[PDB]
Amino acid sequence: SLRGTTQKVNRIREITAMKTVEALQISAQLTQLHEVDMTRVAELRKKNKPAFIEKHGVNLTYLPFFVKAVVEALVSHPNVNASFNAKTKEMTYHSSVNLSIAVDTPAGLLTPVIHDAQDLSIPEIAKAIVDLADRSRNNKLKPNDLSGGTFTITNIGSEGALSDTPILVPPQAGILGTGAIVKRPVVITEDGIDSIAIRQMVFLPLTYDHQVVDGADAGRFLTTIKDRLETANFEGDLQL
Amino acid sequence: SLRGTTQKVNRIREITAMKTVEALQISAQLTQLHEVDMTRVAELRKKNKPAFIEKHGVNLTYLPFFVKAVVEALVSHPNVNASFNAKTKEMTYHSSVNLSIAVDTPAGLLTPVIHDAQDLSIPEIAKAIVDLADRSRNNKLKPNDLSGGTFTITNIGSEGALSDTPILVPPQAGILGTGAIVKRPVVITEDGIDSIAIRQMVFLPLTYDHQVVDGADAGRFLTTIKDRLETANFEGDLQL
Amino acid sequence: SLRGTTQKVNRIREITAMKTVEALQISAQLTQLHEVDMTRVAELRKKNKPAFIEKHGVNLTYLPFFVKAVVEALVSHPNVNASFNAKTKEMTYHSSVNLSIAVDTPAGLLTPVIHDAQDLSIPEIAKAIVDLADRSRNNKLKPNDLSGGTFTITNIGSEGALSDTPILVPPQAGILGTGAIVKRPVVITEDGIDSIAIRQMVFLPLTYDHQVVDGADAGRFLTTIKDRLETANFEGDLQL
Ligand SMILES: CC(C)(COP(=O)(O)OP(=O)(O)OC[C@H]1O[C@@H](n2cnc3c(N)ncnc32)[C@H](O)[C@@H]1OP(=O)(O)O)[C@@H](O)C(=O)NCCC(=O)NCCSO
Ligand SMILES: CC(C)(COP(=O)(O)OP(=O)(O)OC[C@H]1O[C@@H](n2cnc3c(N)ncnc32)[C@H](O)[C@@H]1OP(=O)(O)O)[C@@H](O)C(=O)NCCC(=O)NCCSO
Ligand SMILES: CC(C)(COP(=O)(O)OP(=O)(O)OC[C@H]1O[C@@H](n2cnc3c(N)ncnc32)[C@H](O)[C@@H]1OP(=O)(O)O)[C@@H](O)C(=O)NCCC(=O)NCCSO
């Protein structure tokens, strides 16, 4: 029991405390928020969940769709998949997308990495997330699993949040949160008629480092992700 | 008249300027946002307002309901009612909930404290808020009224805001804002039917220090508060 | 092509990286968010767009309406059109409103200034924005165009964002973002009846420096802007 005691924090939480305090002091963080209509992805996921778990052995969640769209956008917007050397004033644009994934564990938050995520299909991403989350929760990560990330995705919606202002950790330039996907009434406009529909909506807060990305660059990057998700042409990508 | 002059700032505003600049540099602040359906609380408040002011002598606002739920959640999530000693790497989990309440005054913002708020009923909380706000506005606070807080609640909705990213002040680990409670169209899902209802909704932004609380801990804490408020089993708590 | 290279950043981006990192360390930034019903302004803009471009020579966007309301509010709330000298603890309340406007350019974000914006009509503001954006994009700004700002407006909605937490740059005390104006279902309450209407809504995030502005001051300032925009008495102001 913790109430009424003073205790040394565990090793995961000691590193998190030092890294997050320092990260804010050596970058210029801000969080831009876009809304995305996830209805088509939600319909595709519900329809294909049984066939996906039968063929690939893991449950199909929303996270592999967010990962696929974000990784494609990091290839299309290489200025976001980049790091700034504040001493030399040089930007390095990475040729791999090594995608960090935040994992909640009882001992603390861990952020393992999917290396070369740009080469992965949706089934490969789904399996990799399940593997890294299981190894994070059971003390089986190696140093290469926790280093080399070029961008991070954090599932803030897992515990119900609509949004957050996640802390990025240099040398990364961005961290995207996937808010809780919620049914909401929204306006549709088609043929000059405005009307109210029920759609599965999500907020995507992107914390970006203003040293690397300006606000309009963040918006163009998030627009690429939004359009990919809203069109939801992922049937082929599921390999079912 | 202020326009076109240069003047020394008053004592309240000098301390606020120094404390807030320093607070951000010695913590890792981020703000997670959840939405809560306040309809049942709003109905209970409207129904019982006359009996409450008759028996307890103060107007019944939303703030005592937010205080009751937050204080219960600070007891249930002792990891949030805590402080981090960055020199020793030790966490202290406080056995009292001393709840700071932000009060807007013409001379500046003051943050007096309701000590041992965990022992208070809703009528006691309502009276304590009225007392501290009156003493803040009339120069009658003592040093013990302004020290010892373990968490803060700030009514950002008083002047119309939906949300904010409030600044926490170490050694506290969290500050919760109560946004403006607004009627909104929302989706209800029951019996497999999705439908649109008008509900009194609020956003609750929580700024937390990542040295003390990870994002999933913040979400679990806010979920406890959300469920308590949405169920709205406070009839007995009003003592009417 | 950038992917797989390390290159020196351009002059605009070098200054932006240094200025934004420093700005956060010498101020106490937080972002308060209000929602505003832009339907009446959108109707007035659609109705008068052809006559405005015919008489004044520039397209009428939403930005001149936001500028007019913000500039009036900076005159009415001189405490926001101000700077803090942290060495002397003195506040200077500026007698001009020199309004910085963020401009996205291919070489990087530039923030030129509309000096003495308080003396300008909506047609003058529209022309000044077009002039400064064209000169920012074609290397024709002078040092006086980039200095002396007392507040900034940044059009975060240009690239689709609903909101952001813009970084203010001392000695300014506030930066207001104009989110994307989107049709949304909202609740109207009139004659004791609650009902759902389709309205053009916008989020206005204001980043303010807590050294200069407390949360309730930010709310009162944003309320003045919200009421001016929602009433939308700008017909005369268009000079058509
Ligand atoms: C210079 C400027 C501010 C001018 O903005 P503007 O006055 O809105 O002009 P514009 O870009 O020509 O407007 C194009 C259209 O978009 C509309 N629009 C622009 N902003 C909008 C918003 N927030 N919501 C809805 N519509 C918007 C305009 O009304 C105009 O509509 P029509 O074609 O139907 O008349 C803009 O070009 C720009 O650079 N914006 C980006 C600022 C920036 O980079 N900020 C940094 C933080 S994030 O971007
Ligand atoms: C490892 C992982 C990211 C995996 O997430 P995941 O791929 O969504 O898997 P999961 O937790 O098994 O998903 C459980 C269910 O919730 C759903 N879900 C998860 N996130 C969701 C979201 N943002 N919106 C809606 N539904 C969501 C999944 O689709 C799945 O649904 P079904 O049971 O109907 O198929 C997650 O367990 C986790 O640790 N999240 C927290 C991350 C964190 O702590 N971040 C720090 C900042 S705040 O939390
Ligand atoms: C001291 C206090 C917190 C007390 O707040 P309170 O308990 O809500 O009392 P109040 O101001 O008398 O309430 C007036 C009315 O507004 C309502 N109200 C207050 N906050 C509300 C909110 N978030 N949403 C909806 N209604 C609200 C109350 O319920 C009450 O309604 P009725 O008159 O219908 O009964 C407040 O006066 C204050 O100072 N708030 C500002 C705090 C501040 O400056 N924070 C800094 C960050 S931004 O403001």
Side-chain angles (χ1 to χ4, degrees), chain B residues 45 49 59 61-63 102-104 109 133 137 154-158 178-181, chain C residues 32 215-216:
Chain B
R45 189 187 82 101
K49 260 176 75 185
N59 185 40
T61 71
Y62 290 103
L63 198 50
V103 178
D104 168 31
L109 169 63
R137 289 165 181 149
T154 181
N155 194 355
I156 55 165
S158 291
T178 64
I181 299 168
Chain C
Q32 189 168 299

Side-chain angles (χ1 to χ4, degrees), chain C residues 2 55 72 82 91 129 131 148 157-158 175 188 194 215 227 233:
Chain C
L2 305 175
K55 181 169 173 177
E72 290 175 8
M91 199 73 75
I129 294 167
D131 174 63
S158 291
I175 176 164
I188 302 304
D194 296 329
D227 294 344
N233 186 20

Side-chain angles (χ1 to χ4, degrees), chain A residues 31-103:
Chain A
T31 306
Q32 189 168 299
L33 189 139
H34 291 233
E35 68 181 342
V36 178
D37 189 336
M38 296 296 293
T39 312
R40 288 187 185 178
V41 166
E43 288 172 337
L44 192 66
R45 189 187 82 101
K46 186 168 276 190
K47 174 172 182 282
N48 294 285
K49 260 176 75 185
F52 196 94
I53 194 155
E54 185 62 17
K55 181 169 173 177
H56 307 300
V58 293
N59 185 40
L60 176 60
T61 71
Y62 290 103
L63 198 50
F65 295 95
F66 288 127
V67 169
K68 192 79 177 68
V70 167
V71 170
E72 290 175 8
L74 284 164
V75 170
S76 303
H77 296 260
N79 55 303
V80 177
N81 198 49
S83 299
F84 181 64
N85 181 328
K87 293 202 295 193
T88 65
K89 321 298 179 101
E90 295 190 346
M91 199 73 75
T92 294
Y93 305 93
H94 309 300
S95 45
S96 294
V97 179
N98 301 328
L99 189 68
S100 302
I101 302 291
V103 178

